[PDB]
Amino acid sequence: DPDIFNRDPRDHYDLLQRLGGGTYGEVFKARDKVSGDLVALKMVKMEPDDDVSTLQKEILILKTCRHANIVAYHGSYLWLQKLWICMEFCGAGSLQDIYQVTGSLSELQISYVCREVLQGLAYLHSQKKIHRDIKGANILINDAGEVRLADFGISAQIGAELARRLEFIGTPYWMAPEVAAVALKGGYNELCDIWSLGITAIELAELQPPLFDVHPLRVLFLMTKSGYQPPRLKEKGKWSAAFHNFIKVTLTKSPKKRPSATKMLSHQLVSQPGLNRGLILDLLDKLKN
Amino acid sequence: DPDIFNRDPRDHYDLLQRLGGGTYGEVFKARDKVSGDLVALKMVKMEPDDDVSTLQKEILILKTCRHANIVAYHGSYLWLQKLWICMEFCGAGSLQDIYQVTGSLSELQISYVCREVLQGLAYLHSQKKIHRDIKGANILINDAGEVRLADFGISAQIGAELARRLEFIGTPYWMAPEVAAVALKGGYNELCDIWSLGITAIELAELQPPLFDVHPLRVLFLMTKSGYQPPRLKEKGKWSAAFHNFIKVTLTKSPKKRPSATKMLSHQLVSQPGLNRGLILDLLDKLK
Numbered sequence A: 001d002p003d004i005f006n007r008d009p010r011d012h013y014d015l016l017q018r019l020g021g022g023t024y025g026e027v028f029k030a031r032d033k034v035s036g037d038l039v040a041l042k043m044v045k046m047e048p049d050d051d052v053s054t055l056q057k058e059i060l061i062l063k064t065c066r067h068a069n070i071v072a073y074h075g076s077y078l079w080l081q082k083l084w085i086c087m088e089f090c091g092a093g094s095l096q097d098i099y100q101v102t103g104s105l106s107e108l109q110i111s112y113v114c115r116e117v118l119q120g121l122a123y124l125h126s127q128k129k130i131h132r133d134i135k136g137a138n139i140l141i142n143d144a145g146e147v148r149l150a151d152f153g154i155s156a157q158i159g160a161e162l163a164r165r166l167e168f169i170g171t172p173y174w175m176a177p178e179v180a181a182v183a184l185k186g187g188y189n190e191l192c193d194i195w196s197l198g199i200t201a202i203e204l205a206e207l208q209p210p211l212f213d214v215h216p217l218r219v220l221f222l223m224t225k226s227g228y229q230p231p232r233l234k235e236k237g238k239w240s241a242a243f244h245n246f247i248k249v250t251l252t253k254s255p256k257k258r259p260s261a262t263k264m265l266s267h268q269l270v271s272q273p274g275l276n277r278g279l280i281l282d283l284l285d286k287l288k289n
Numbered sequence B: 001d002p003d004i005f006n007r008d009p010r011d012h013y014d015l016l017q018r019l020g021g022g023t024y025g026e027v028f029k030a031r032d033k034v035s036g037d038l039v040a041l042k043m044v045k046m047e048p049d050d051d052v053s054t055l056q057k058e059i060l061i062l063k064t065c066r067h068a069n070i071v072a073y074h075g076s077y078l079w080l081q082k083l084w085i086c087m088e089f090c091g092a093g094s095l096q097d098i099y100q101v102t103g104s105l106s107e108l109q110i111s112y113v114c115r116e117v118l119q120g121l122a123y124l125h126s127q128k129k130i131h132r133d134i135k136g137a138n139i140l141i142n143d144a145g146e147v148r149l150a151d152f153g154i155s156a157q158i159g160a161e162l163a164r165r166l167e168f169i170g171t172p173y174w175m176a177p178e179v180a181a182v183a184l185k186g187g188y189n190e191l192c193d194i195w196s197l198g199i200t201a202i203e204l205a206e207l208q209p210p211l212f213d214v215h216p217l218r219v220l221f222l223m224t225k226s227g228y229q230p231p232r233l234k235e236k237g238k239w240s241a242a243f244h245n246f247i248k249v250t251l252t253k254s255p256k257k258r259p260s261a262t263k264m265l266s267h268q269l270v271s272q273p274g275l276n277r278g279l280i281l282d283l284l285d286k287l288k
Ligand SMILES: CC(C)n1cnnc1-c1cccc(N2Cc3c(CN)cccc3C2=O)n1
Pocket: A019, A020, A021, A022, A023, A027, A040, A042, A071, A087, A088, A089, A090, A091, A092, A093, A094, A097, A137, A138, A140, A150, A151, A152
């Protein structure tokens, strides 16, 4: 990055609190020494021999996003084998931080979250970007009750891993076109984010994703099996027919039939009035008292 | 490997000449100091910090094959950070070593090689193994004109990478079924070997695979294009309708439509009664 700060970020910010980790790195709450503005600073250990392609990709993804529902990027620092990515601070943390205190979200609360995430996903997919890690831990909430997607760590890692395999596949002259296609395009597309959103709506409603108690390797085998049945909401009567249908369509098994983010934004669950940040401000009041 | 010989192979074998390298390692021609039997020894540097996964996978693939069309395995040695894989020596070398001297193979010689490779592929696929690197350089010929598939280096690397990538993929509860499918299955199957054989048949006929002159990166991009046209034999009149048809069906773009190794064994080209080792012994006579 030519815009990188070759300086210690503690010249500009006071580190206030450890916020936890992401796919990689550790996130800090920090305060601008001159303005008093709060930021989130993600510190990643970056040794001299290490491949910097994943972090280069993550900063490129963030830097070229200009949408309210994607965490804002302020800049990055490189100093003493540490790279610091400076981003928008979201005072209430993740939806997982929240629901671990408050309990299950109401259907209206889930609907507002799903609409805001779909707006961010529509934007990302309009740039040929894929989040690939949509879940409650990656959906952040600020003090105003606004929603922001975060942690492009998985997306950047896939992007760097695919580019590293490309320069090392060797002679392709005897390769089958499907092997070359998966080596260049990963074998799936942006609709994987729509499925993840459906699982996330279940997560916000039930405090855990479906099959959370099943071994992760076994969950992968069950999903790859012909005849895999998409998950559903456990309680029938507690949720509206519109919410049950939202889960049904986002959790379409075939990616060829799964609706896009833009198509999902016209679903009645997320296009209803009364969907605004005040619903999350009520959730934040429940967290406090 | 549980059967590894913890001794230096040079105590039992005399190294006679370098046979080049594989996907990794260096292959040597060696002679049994007591019996006089020839073997091929593949040497790979093994550091204590180095991952054993790929070599473990290569040895397991080799050790569990018991088929006439797959290079025989004799054992492995580990001593002073060097791993030595002991295999069947194939006196005439690879088909690439041969055609660089003899020129293009005749249709009958190619038909015979194709049948024999399909037999080894049918065996590999029945064991749930995939070669993934079928080409003239990996099809070996012994002094009897018999055919052996070799170098499971790419197969071992993919298998080890697939298993290594799983742990670094993280939690899967929010993953779409198609992402889980490419994580566990890789996004393709054993029919990739049928295509590679189709390309090999062109390579044996023309001394190069199609698009040999085109930069390797551009070839991959061309192949990924939704409208990529499977290649064909350059000369039309030189080859029978049966051979053109064998190329057409092995190079079926759609993997769901590409015939299996067992289905291909009933194709008119490779089910001809006149196919035998004598065709390659005639090719081998041309060398001496
Ligand atoms: C999702 C997060 C781990 N992350 C991974 N890569 N970038 C980010 C990222 C980017 C911007 C902001 C923030 N956070 C996190 C957070 C927590 C977390 N318990 C708790 C409280 C506030 C915040 C806040 O402002 N995080």
